[PDB]
Amino acid sequence: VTLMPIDCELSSWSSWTTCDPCQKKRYRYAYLLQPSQFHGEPCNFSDKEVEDCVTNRPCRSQVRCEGFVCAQTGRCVNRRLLCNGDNDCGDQSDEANCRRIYKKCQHEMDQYWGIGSLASGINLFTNSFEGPVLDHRYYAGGCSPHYILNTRFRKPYNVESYTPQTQGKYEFILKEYESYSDFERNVTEKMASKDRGKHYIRRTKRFSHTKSVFLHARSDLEVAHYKLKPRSLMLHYEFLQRVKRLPLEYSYGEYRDLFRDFGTHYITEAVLGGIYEYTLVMNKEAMERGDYTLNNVHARGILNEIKDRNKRDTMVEDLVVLVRGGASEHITTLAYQELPTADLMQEWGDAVQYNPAIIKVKVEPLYELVTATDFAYSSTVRQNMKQALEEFQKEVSSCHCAPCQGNGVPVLKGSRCDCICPVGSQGLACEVSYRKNTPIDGKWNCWSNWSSCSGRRKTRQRQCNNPPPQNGGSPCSGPASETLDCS
Amino acid sequence: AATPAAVTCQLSNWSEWTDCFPCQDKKYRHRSLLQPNKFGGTICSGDIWDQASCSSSTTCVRQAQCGQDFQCKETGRCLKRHLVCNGDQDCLDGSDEDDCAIDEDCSQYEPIPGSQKAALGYNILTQEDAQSVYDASYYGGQCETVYNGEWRELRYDSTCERLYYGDDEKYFRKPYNFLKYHFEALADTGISSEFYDNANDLLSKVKKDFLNELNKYNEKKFIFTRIFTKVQTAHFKMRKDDIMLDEGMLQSLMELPDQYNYGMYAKFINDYGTHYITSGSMGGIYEYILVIDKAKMESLGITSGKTERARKAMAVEDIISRVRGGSSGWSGGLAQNRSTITYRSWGRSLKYNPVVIDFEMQPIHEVLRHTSLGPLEAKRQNLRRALDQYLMEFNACRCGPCFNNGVPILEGTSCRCQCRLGSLGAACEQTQTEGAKADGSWSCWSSWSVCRAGIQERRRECDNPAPQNGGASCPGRKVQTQAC
Amino acid sequence: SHIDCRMSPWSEWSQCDPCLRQMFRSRSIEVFGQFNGKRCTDAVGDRRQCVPTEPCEDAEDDCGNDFQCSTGRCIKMRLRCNGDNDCGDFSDEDDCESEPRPPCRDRVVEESELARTAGYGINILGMDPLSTPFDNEFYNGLCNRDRDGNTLTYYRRPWNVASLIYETKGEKNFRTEHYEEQIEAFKTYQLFLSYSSKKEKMFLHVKGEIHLGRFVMRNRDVVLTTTFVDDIKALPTTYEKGEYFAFLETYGTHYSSSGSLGGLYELIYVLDKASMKRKGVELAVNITSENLIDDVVSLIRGGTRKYAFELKEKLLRGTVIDVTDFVNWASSINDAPVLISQKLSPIYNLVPVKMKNAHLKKQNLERAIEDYINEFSVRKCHTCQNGGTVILMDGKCLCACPFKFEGIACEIS
Amino acid sequence: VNITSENLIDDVVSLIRGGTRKYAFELKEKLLRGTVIDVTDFVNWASSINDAPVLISQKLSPIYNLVPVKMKNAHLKKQNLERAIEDYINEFS
Amino acid sequence: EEQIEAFYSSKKEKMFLHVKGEIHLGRFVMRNRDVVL
Amino acid sequence: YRVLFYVDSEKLKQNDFNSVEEKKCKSSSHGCKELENALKAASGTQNNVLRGEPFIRGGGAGFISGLSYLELDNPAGNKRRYSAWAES
Ligand SMILES: *[C@@H]1O[C@H](CO)[C@@H](O[C@@H]2O[C@H](CO)[C@@H](O[C@@H]3O[C@H](CO)[C@@H](O)[C@H](O)[C@@H]3O)[C@H](O)[C@H]2NC(C)=O)[C@H](O)[C@H]1NC(C)=O
Ligand SMILES: *[C@@H]1O[C@H](CO)[C@@H](O[C@@H]2O[C@H](CO)[C@@H](O)[C@H](O)[C@H]2NC(C)=O)[C@H](O)[C@H]1NC(C)=O
Ligand SMILES: *[C@@H]1O[C@H](CO)[C@@H](O)[C@H](O)[C@H]1NC(C)=O
Ligand SMILES: *[C@@H]1O[C@H](CO)[C@@H](O)[C@H](O)[C@H]1NC(C)=O
Ligand SMILES: *[C@@H]1O[C@H](CO)[C@@H](O)[C@H](O)[C@@H]1O
Ligand SMILES: *[C@@H]1O[C@H](CO)[C@@H](O)[C@H](O)[C@@H]1O
Ligand SMILES: *[C@@H]1O[C@H](CO)[C@@H](O)[C@H](O)[C@@H]1O
Ligand SMILES: *[C@@H]1O[C@H](CO)[C@@H](O)[C@H](O)[C@@H]1O
Ligand SMILES: *[C@H]1O[C@H](CO)[C@@H](O)[C@H](O)[C@@H]1O
Numbered sequence A: 001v002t003l004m005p006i007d008c009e010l011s012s013w014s015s016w017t018t019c020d021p022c023q024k025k026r027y028r029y030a031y032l033l034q035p036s037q038f039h040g041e042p043c044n045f046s047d048k049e050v051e052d053c054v055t056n057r058p059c060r061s062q063v064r065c066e067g068f069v070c071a072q073t074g075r076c077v078n079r080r081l082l083c084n085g086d087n088d089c090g091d092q093s094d095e096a097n098c099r100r101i102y103k104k105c106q107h108e109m110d111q112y113w114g115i116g117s118l119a120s121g122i123n124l125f126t127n128s129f130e131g132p133v134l135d136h137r138y139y140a141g142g143c144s145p146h147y148i149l150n151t152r153f154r155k156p157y158n159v160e161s162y163t164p165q166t167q168g169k170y171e172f173i174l175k176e177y178e179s180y181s182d183f184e185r186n187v188t189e190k191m192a193s194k195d196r197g198k199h200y201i202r203r204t205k206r207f208s209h210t211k212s213v214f215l216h217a218r219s220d221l222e223v224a225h226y227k228l229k230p231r232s233l234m235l236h237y238e239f240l241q242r243v244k245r246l247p248l249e250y251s252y253g254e255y256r257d258l259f260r261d262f263g264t265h266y267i268t269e270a271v272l273g274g275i276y277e278y279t280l281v282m283n284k285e286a287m288e289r290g291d292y293t294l295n296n297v298h299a300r301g302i303l304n305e306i307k308d309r310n311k312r313d314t315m316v317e318d319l320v321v322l323v324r325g326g327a328s329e330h331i332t333t334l335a336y337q338e339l340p341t342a343d344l345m346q347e348w349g350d351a352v353q354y355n356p357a358i359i360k361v362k363v364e365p366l367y368e369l370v371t372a373t374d375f376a377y378s379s380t381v382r383q384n385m386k387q388a389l390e391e392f393q394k395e396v397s398s399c400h401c402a403p404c405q406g407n408g409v410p411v412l413k414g415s416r417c418d419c420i421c422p423v424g425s426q427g428l429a430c431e432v433s434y435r436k437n438t439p440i441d442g443k444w445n446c447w448s449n450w451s452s453c454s455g456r457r458k459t460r461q462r463q464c465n466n467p468p469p470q471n472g473g474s475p476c477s478g479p480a481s482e483t484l485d486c487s
Numbered sequence B: 001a002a003t004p005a006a007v008t009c010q011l012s013n014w015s016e017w018t019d020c021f022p023c024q025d026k027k028y029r030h031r032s033l034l035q036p037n038k039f040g041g042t043i044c045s046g047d048i049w050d051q052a053s054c055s056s057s058t059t060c061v062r063q064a065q066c067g068q069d070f071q072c073k074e075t076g077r078c079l080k081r082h083l084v085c086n087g088d089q090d091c092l093d094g095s096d097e098d099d100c101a102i103d104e105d106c107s108q109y110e111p112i113p114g115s116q117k118a119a120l121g122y123n124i125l126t127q128e129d130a131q132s133v134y135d136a137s138y139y140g141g142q143c144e145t146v147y148n149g150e151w152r153e154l155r156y157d158s159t160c161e162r163l164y165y166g167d168d169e170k171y172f173r174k175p176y177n178f179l180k181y182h183f184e185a186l187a188d189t190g191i192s193s194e195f196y197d198n199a200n201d202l203l204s205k206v207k208k209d210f211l212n213e214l215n216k217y218n219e220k221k222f223i224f225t226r227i228f229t230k231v232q233t234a235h236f237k238m239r240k241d242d243i244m245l246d247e248g249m250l251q252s253l254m255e256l257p258d259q260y261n262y263g264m265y266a267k268f269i270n271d272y273g274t275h276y277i278t279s280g281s282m283g284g285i286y287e288y289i290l291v292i293d294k295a296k297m298e299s300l301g302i303t304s305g306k307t308e309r310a311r312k313a314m315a316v317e318d319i320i321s322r323v324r325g326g327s328s329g330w331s332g333g334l335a336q337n338r339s340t341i342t343y344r345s346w347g348r349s350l351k352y353n354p355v356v357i358d359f360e361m362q363p364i365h366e367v368l369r370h371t372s373l374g375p376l377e378a379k380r381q382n383l384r385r386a387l388d389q390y391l392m393e394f395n396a397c398r399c400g401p402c403f404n405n406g407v408p409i410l411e412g413t414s415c416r417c418q419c420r421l422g423s424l425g426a427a428c429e430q431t432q433t434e435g436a437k438a439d440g441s442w443s444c445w446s447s448w449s450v451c452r453a454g455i456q457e458r459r460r461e462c463d464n465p466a467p468q469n470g471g472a473s474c475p476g477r478k479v480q481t482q483a484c
Numbered sequence C: 001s002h003i004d005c006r007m008s009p010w011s012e013w014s015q016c017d018p019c020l021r022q023m024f025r026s027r028s029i030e031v032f033g034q035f036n037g038k039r040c041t042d043a044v045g046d047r048r049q050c051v052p053t054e055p056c057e058d059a060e061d062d063c064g065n066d067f068q069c070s071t072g073r074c075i076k077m078r079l080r081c082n083g084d085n086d087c088g089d090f091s092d093e094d095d096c097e098s099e100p101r102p103p104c105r106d107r108v109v110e111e112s113e114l115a116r117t118a119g120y121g122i123n124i125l126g127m128d129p130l131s132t133p134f135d136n137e138f139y140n141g142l143c144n145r146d147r148d149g150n151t152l153t154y155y156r157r158p159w160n161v162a163s164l165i166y167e168t169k170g171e172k173n174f175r176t177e178h179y180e181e182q183i184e185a186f187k188t189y190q191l192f193l194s195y196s197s198k199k200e201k202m203f204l205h206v207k208g209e210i211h212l213g214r215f216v217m218r219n220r221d222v223v224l225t226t227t228f229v230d231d232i233k234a235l236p237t238t239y240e241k242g243e244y245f246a247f248l249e250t251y252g253t254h255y256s257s258s259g260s261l262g263g264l265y266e267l268i269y270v271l272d273k274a275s276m277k278r279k280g281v282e283l284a285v286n287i288t289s290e291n292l293i294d295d296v297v298s299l300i301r302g303g304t305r306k307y308a309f310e311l312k313e314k315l316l317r318g319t320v321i322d323v324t325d326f327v328n329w330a331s332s333i334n335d336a337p338v339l340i341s342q343k344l345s346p347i348y349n350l351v352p353v354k355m356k357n358a359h360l361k362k363q364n365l366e367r368a369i370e371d372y373i374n375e376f377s378v379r380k381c382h383t384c385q386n387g388g389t390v391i392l393m394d395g396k397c398l399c400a401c402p403f404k405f406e407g408i409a410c411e412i413s
Numbered sequence D: 001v002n003i004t005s006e007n008l009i010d011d012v013v014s015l016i017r018g019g020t021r022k023y024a025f026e027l028k029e030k031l032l033r034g035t036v037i038d039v040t041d042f043v044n045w046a047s048s049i050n051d052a053p054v055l056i057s058q059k060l061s062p063i064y065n066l067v068p069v070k071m072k073n074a075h076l077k078k079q080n081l082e083r084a085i086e087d088y089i090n091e092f093s
Numbered sequence E: 001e002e003q004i005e006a007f008y009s010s011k012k013e014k015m016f017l018h019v020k021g022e023i024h025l026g027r028f029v030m031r032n033r034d035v036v037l
Numbered sequence F: 001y002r003v004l005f006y007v008d009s010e011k012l013k014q015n016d017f018n019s020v021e022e023k024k025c026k027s028s029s030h031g032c033k034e035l036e037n038a039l040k041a042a043s044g045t046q047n048n049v050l051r052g053e054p055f056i057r058g059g060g061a062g063f064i065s066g067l068s069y070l071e072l073d074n075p076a077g078n079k080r081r082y083s084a085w086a087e088s
């Protein structure tokens, strides 16, 4: 193996912030200067440090509640939500000491299938879901019935619509090629006289046969459309509290650890369903050489005869199958190497309805949740969170990773980077393969910092993995340099 | 071929007794693995750690003092008062439900699939699960629920003739120590197959009026296939702040001295693991390999006269087939054959028995930082100091070379080379020819060098042997340096 | 000549142990027997009654405000009435005429038939399992309900079994490896020589490992069986080898601190076959040899009677095995598991601190287990001849050799 | 040839321990007839070992170790049982 | 089998076929103290 | 419900052959000579491309994934599956 294992390096510490007026604390942090890769040391030694202070400054942190303050969670429920026979506080506190219970839901009701997943934030730069940011177990007044098929559902307060938009693309290509060539060239020669004589032969073949198959099947099934309300969202307890812990002063660390727990954005609108994708590539070759000769001479005489015969064959085949959404038996029977029968497809699509994946998303950045009805100093938290979001996007984008071999895709998983391999190579760098060459796709290096003013510039070099090596593939798809106005 | 050299177990002599603690009535002492018993050799009766009774002069600490709030009478946990009488058993004694949120109905839903395995510590030297680090069943006053993506399960009703899906296990309760658990259904499968064949046939004849005739045939065939399939039933992330430790880890952490004492800290690393899971992926994995080599060679030579003939033929087949997750039955079935029967049935069993696919983990000392207990900095630095030694002393790299690609492990004081084929030892083979492909794997750390104020070193070798025959070299960090 | 059991002289006797009302004597084993001579059956020690030469000390080891049960055992008062088999036997009915309340409220939970057996004693000689030192029908007032197990049915996990996780894993390893060869030659009055040789080699290895989870035993607050704690109370306190060996021979040198449950199958075919011939006349000679070893072995462990013994032999024969026969056997591992492999803790770690004289008993056990491993050593026996090695068994040392050398010492060919 | 019909298979021994006598007889009868037992048979035998077990291996100690320590001349009786056990080895060849 | 013949000589045979089986139902181990006879 | 289905295939095969044979003799010291040659080149190709893009809107997700699944033997889609979709 050509490897050197590379250790993670965090920076030297920031200077401390001055002590916060309302957290009574101070903060310091490091930037990841190099991610751990190829089995270097696991690092993650605490990326933030925090200390207490004496406080010499005023604070106004109590945003009041015309509602009822829930005993454990601190949520402000509207006073009409008490004694409805339902948990609106998160920890049941709204339903204590009620002289009667006034149910609105006359009937039993389901939550829409998977509606809680969409209540959590996404780290948009890795498409990973993170912690809960919205409370889809909160209904306010609720209890207007919705039906998908014959099942009745209760709409969450935060959800503007969840509805069964229901669509299916299937796409199929089967491309096949065959090419064969045969060459033969025979010869015979003779002489005699009354003494002398000669006889000679040559016979030959060259042959080749070649075949290729590319097959690609994709089903994009959609089974629901989701949109969140644009305003007045009831947030989740665990997020609401970490946002209340954020400093008024800008420390990057304490805002970064919000993103590492609850992500960077929230899902405002989404397309729900399943992907089935199958793609087969096969290449096949056969090759031959034959060469035969005799030479015979007489006057006393001599004979020589030779035969040479060669056959070569190869086949190489790669298949990838990818399934999203559904139930585990349908998932595995589609995961299997052989194209489905329509019965499995039917049962998979039927199960995708009850456990959809997310096909398409409209985000909003997470600071758009930090509204003054829930948080004091909200505008300074927003402005901090905006700046942290730009700095964090420059940390968690995988451009920092060293290049994989074998066309591996590097993904920065934490403070550590994993080369996800294509089919047909193994080992931590994707080095272990039988293949003489495989197309390297070009990989971008990280984008250089904003220079000067009157229109700043940023630059990129396609250098992190240079595109051409070992019969290279496509050079990178994005803007190779970029500019934006001070004002 | 290689040859073994047996060695029996040795431990170093006892450390002097650690002085009698105020609340445990206990003393501790330890020893070190001066040499673990290698492939050939007797086990020590002795282990690394010893504990003894002792009365002590002072009075044990008052249990009323934690957080200005409730703490349980016979165990570790200190609780926010709204957990007392919540209707749920928040500590081992149940004292947080004695003399009575309130009356929680949330136990209508069972705990999340695999809430246990993610709560256990893990050991990087042995790959074993440890005791509970997190409390797998602490709910912290929360009534929080995950939708089961797999709840769909058929039932007949014989009265009024209907076939209908059960409406059972639709939700699971999430433990407080889990930030998110997500029931996302994925599959990915990747399959590569490569075949290469060569056959060559040759003749040569000369006659002069002496005769010579030569005939050759050669054949080679190679087949490879690899299949990898993974199915996620769920993905999880454990909380990074306000962690509620298991009562056992909590009590064992109270029981740690504030001073450094390698024995009691090494015992906590043994008992609660080197690491704890921060996040991981749940469901099932199938992996399969076939590697097949065949060859066939024949040759004849005749001249005048005398005749000689030779033939050689070969076939070597490796199948590795490993199923993680599912029912014990269908895991054996899918290990034995691959089909739309075995994949479909295996996935039906992943509905009920998921297993951890891959996960992320951090060193056990990094838990203390994030606990509900407040600062424990002295214990954390001791717990790091011990772990930085434990990962040297108990390390499988101290076992023998395991020639022909065997896997070393240390358990107790004792080595196992899990040799992949042939009878165990340093050397391992009796079936294979002496031509076999095998790696070099690490010959372990030196102690730190004598040092200048700014120069100190540590070194390795790739193995005691070089890589065997033609074979792979190690990942290449041969030398390392330290702060002296 | 053949070999007989032999021992040292007996040592000098103990004093009378005042509370135990006995005296003790011991002897070393020196040869086990070998080569089909007089096999040992012979004991390490013996005991005699005495009227004691001094008073016994106060026996009672009471934990205080804890309930002292009809067993040897103390318990905390939350478990004095708990509607459960608290404290190692029923001991409670005269108190619990009130406060019935169970650990599990309104529910019907069953015992884990795997967890009851968790924490086997193990003897390092042969690595046989023995029944648990640990109680494992004690629940510490915790309900601790698991829905786990592949048969989709709930169970109550017993207190000492800190983890029992059904990590299902099914592996098959298969290897075949052939090398196959031929060499032949040929070369008034006349001369000729004809020569031929042929060789065939096969190595098949197959193993199928099927897990039914893993148990990890608790490393504090372990609640032990009444029989085991009593069998620690009844000890000499003076390092009498034969009396300590009697405790090892009923609870093991070690316990499995964590063990992996399930089943295994394993198969071997080795075939190694050769034939050689030469014939000639020179102005007759005819000289031959044949050498064959053929050895096929099958092991199955775990699962129920029918399926295992079907599969054992189906796999040994040429038979193309039905996948559903595997599914049946591998499913029956749910009902009838076996201990595949495990981590071993020396048994003295289960001598509870907060019992009288505990640490003295531990250092005695640590010495005794070292002796138990030493005088049962193979290294004392006489050497095997040719390619064999000295096998050890109770009352014999021997060897056997599938390699054309023969007898109980492989001496002849 | 028809090996199951033929006189050719003769010289097979039988040792068989435990199980219900029907299935032990059937296995013996097939072998002394010069014929193979079917895999159906062995599993039927293995099912019957639940009724009628035998010991495949044993670890052995002389019986005097059972003589209770409370016996009124206990050590003398045990010592005479050792003196008696020792004579069996001479009482037979 | 081995033969040397010259019209010194020697001739040799050794041959067997074994089938061996075990069926195992359970281990028992029994007390060495507190025995009730 | 929409289907586009498209099948396209091309085949070529070629064989070309050339041969020469020559002879000479003389007599009065007799003699003769002969020469012969043959040559072949042959080549062929196939291309086959089969595409299809079923698209459905409306109906239940299982009926959609069943109906949109392309039977290469019946690329318009099957009477039963299609009627089930029209029910859903
Ligand atoms: C140029 O010379 C080559 C080599 O001699 C010719 O190929 C040969 O063609 C003959 C007649 O088709 C083949 O003989 C046949 O063999 C088959 C079995 O393979 C047998 O069933 C038939 O009855 C017959 O004996 C010969 O095998 C084949 N040799 C090879 C190596 O391909 C070729 O046809 C010649 N081309 C010209 C222009 O004459
Ligand atoms: C697993 O078992 C199945 C049994 O059906 C195998 O599938 C059969 O394979 C044989 C091979 O000769 C074919 O003749 C049958 O037609 C196949 N039946 C079908 C359609 O399933 C399967 O091949 C086995 N697993 C593997 C990978 O060989
Ligand atoms: C071989 O002979 C036996 C009788 O000994 C007869 O039953 C059998 O049919 C013959 N062959 C077969 C079909 O097994
Ligand atoms: C001699 O030749 C015969 C006939 O092939 C053969 O059976 C025998 O084994 C050879 N060896 C001798 C007779 O020494
Ligand atoms: C923040 O950082 C400096 C580093 O020298 C500390 O010493 C000090 O506490 C300051 O507030
Ligand atoms: C502790 O180890 C010491 C060796 O220094 C012994 O002397 C003592 O008996 C105990 O084994
Ligand atoms: C030897 O090999 C492993 C790689 O498998 C390294 O992680 C490690 O350094 C070990 O000692
Ligand atoms: C020890 O052996 C002596 C023999 O010297 C006997 O007297 C006694 O019975 C014990 O076995
Ligand atoms: C431009 O964006 C901000 C402005 O300071 C910084 O992250 C950096 O200067 C970047 O290049």
Ligand SMILES: [Ca+2]
Binding pocket: A081, A082, A083, A084, A085, A086, A087, A088, A089, A094, A095
């Ligand atoms: Ca309410």
Ligand SMILES: [Ca+2]
Binding pocket: B083, B084, B085, B086, B087, B088, B089, B090, B096, B097
């Ligand atoms: Ca409680």
Ligand SMILES: [Ca+2]
Binding pocket: C079, C080, C081, C082, C083, C084, C086, C092, C096
């Ligand atoms: Ca009770």
